Every structure is written in structure tokens, then in C-alpha cells.
Design a protein around this ligand. Structure first.
Ligand SMILES: [Ca+2]
Ligand SMILES: [Ca+2]
Length: 284
């Protein structure tokens, strides 16, 4: 139904193999039921945004050859949107749209803290343990069974590193903190979705059986930005035209994880399928 194929983009190349199901849980399946052509680009987590960007460009080149489409519609999460922005900035004629879903568009405060912990920069022990136990719980839930090894993925998501990325690829970033960027830059459409953790944990419905959610709530308390999804602050997610960012969902919830266990009986998959129809309505 969309003119151009949809490319789902995320970091963690080994996710599907190690976890046993897709990063975007049930989302590609749902989009294909609505007649969209869908592909997933799983990029290398333990490296720079620019390296993921180059990875994604190679993926897109091969895909465009195989489809004879002239452009792609990117839908990225977390690391994904930065790689998408790299490709859009550098190869705008090959990108119809960039949609950012809880993208780390201006850095992650927990990544910042993680680096301070790793550098032993005067972080009190009780905070060190809370942060490391949270990440361990998240990793173990997905993998099945160390938490300091996660810095490999967060290294490229610090405020300092993303600020440097934004300096090189400023397209569609908001001019004011917590605002919106230009919808169309260099012929490419930019959209953003977001969320932040809300309410007391008792009312989270499906998430009560998801061990990652309590961990995200722990990480959430260490942000100076009070509205955050446990990994990124609400304002940091902003890119291009806002669609909606007040979902009561953590970072992991917004890709329908773990295995469909989300907050408040929200239909996360519907966020994606409705947006795909929205892209189609914009002649994309
Ligand atoms: Ca970078
Ligand atoms: Ca969840």
C-alpha cells in the first residue's frame, strides 16, 4: 500500500538469533497483512552511529536493486533512527521518509551515567548496583541468562557522542528543546514517535509479567529529564514532525517487547500499521 518499501531499523544484529524472535515483535508480520512490502535491517550495536549508517546504506543499495524501488521508508527504534538519519543526510534521493520511534536523537542520560560508572567517576556504590542489576535483568530476560558488557552498545548513545553526530547530521532536529523539527528536509519526510513511563507500576497490566519493565523504572529514576522511557528522555527523542509521544510505555514496550507484554493494554502494533497507512496517504 505504501509506494516505497518499509525498512524496519534497529541495533543488535544478533538479536533474532540469540533471543529467538524479532526485535520489532510481530510488527513486520502485521505490516505485511496490510499489503506493505517490509524488510528489516539489523545493525551492529557495538560501534558508532556512522558505522551503522554505512551498514544501512549498503543494505539499502542492495535492497533498491532487488526491488527496483527508488526510495525506502525507514522506521527506526533506539539506535536505528541515527543510522537512518545518516543515510537520509547523505543519500536523500534514496530515502522517502525517516520515522523515529523512541530514537536517541539527542543522547541518553543512562548511557552518560553508565560511562561514569565504567570510568569510576565518583558514583556511589548503591547507584552502581541499582543500574547494573537493572541492565542485567533486562539482558537476562532476553538472552535467557555480564551487565557491564552492555556499555558496548551505550558508548555511541551518550549525550557527548550524539551531540557530535547531530553536528554532522543536523537535518530535521528541533530548533528548540522539546519542540519539533522541519517535516521535510532535502525532500525527505521526517516523523517522530515517543513515550515515557507513567503511573504507578501496579496498574501496568501486561507489563506485570515482563521483568524488563521494573528494571526500566529503576533506570528511569536516574534521569534529570523526568519524562523518559528508561533509556532516553522524552525531549531527546524528537525529530521532524511529531505524531504522538505521550504513550505510557517504556523503551522496550515501544517495539512490543517482551513478546507482546506491554503497558496498559496498549496496541503497540497498531501504532506501526496506522503510521504505514499515514505514509501511504502522503504518497510515500
Ligand atoms: Ca557516533
Ligand atoms: Ca514490556
Amino acid at each position: 500500500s505504501t509506494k516505497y518499501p518499509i525498512v524496519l531499523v534497529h541495533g543488535l544484529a544478533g538479536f533474532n538469533e540469540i533471543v529467538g524472535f524479532p526485535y520489532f515483535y510481530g510488527i513486520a508480520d502485521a505490516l505485511r497483512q496490510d499489503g506493505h512490502q517490509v524488510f528489516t535491517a539489523s545493525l551492529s550495536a557495538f560501534n558508532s552511529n556512522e558505522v551503522r549508517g554505512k551498514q544501512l546504506w549498503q543494505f539499502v543499495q542492495t535492497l533498491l536493486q532487488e526491488t527496483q524501488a527508488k526510495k525506502v521508508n525507514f522506521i527506526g527504534h533506539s539506535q536505528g533512527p541515527l543510522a537512518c538519519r545518516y543515510v537520509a543526510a547523505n543519500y536523500p534521493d534514496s530515502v522517502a521518509s525517516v520515522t523515529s520511534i523512541n530514537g536517541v536523537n539527542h543522547g541518553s542520560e543512562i548511557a552518560d551515567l553508565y560511562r561514569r560508572i565504567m570510568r569510576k567517576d565518583s558514583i556511589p556504590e548503591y547507584i552502581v548496583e541499582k543500574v547494573l542489576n537493572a541492565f542485567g535483568t533486562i539482558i537476562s530476560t532476553f538472552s535467557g541468562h555480564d551487565p557491564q558488557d552492555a556499555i558496548a552498545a551505550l558508548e555511541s548513545l551518550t549525550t557527548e557522542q550524539v551531540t557530535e553526530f547531530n553536528n554532522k547530521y543536523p537535518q530535521a532536529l528541533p530548533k528548540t528543546p522539546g519542540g519539533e523539527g522541519d517535516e521535510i528536509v532535502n525532500g525527505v519526510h521526517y516523523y517522530c514517535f515517543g513515550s515515557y513511563i507513567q503511573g504507578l507500576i501496579a496498574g501496568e497490566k501486561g507489563n506485570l509479567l515482563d521483568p524488563t519493565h521494573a528494571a526500566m523504572r529503576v533506570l528511569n529514576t536516574f534521569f534529570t529529564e523526568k519524562q523518559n522511557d528508561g533509556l532516553v528522555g522524552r525531549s531527546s527523542m524528537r525529530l521532524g514532525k511529531l505524531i504522538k509521544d505521550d504513550y505510557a510505555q517504556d523503551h522496550i514496550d515501544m517495539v512490543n517487547q517482551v513478546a507482546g507484554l506491554v503497558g496498559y493494554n496498549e496496541d503497540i502494533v497498531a501504532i506501526y500499521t496506522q503510521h504505514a497507512k499515514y505514509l501511504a496517504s502522503k504518497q510515500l
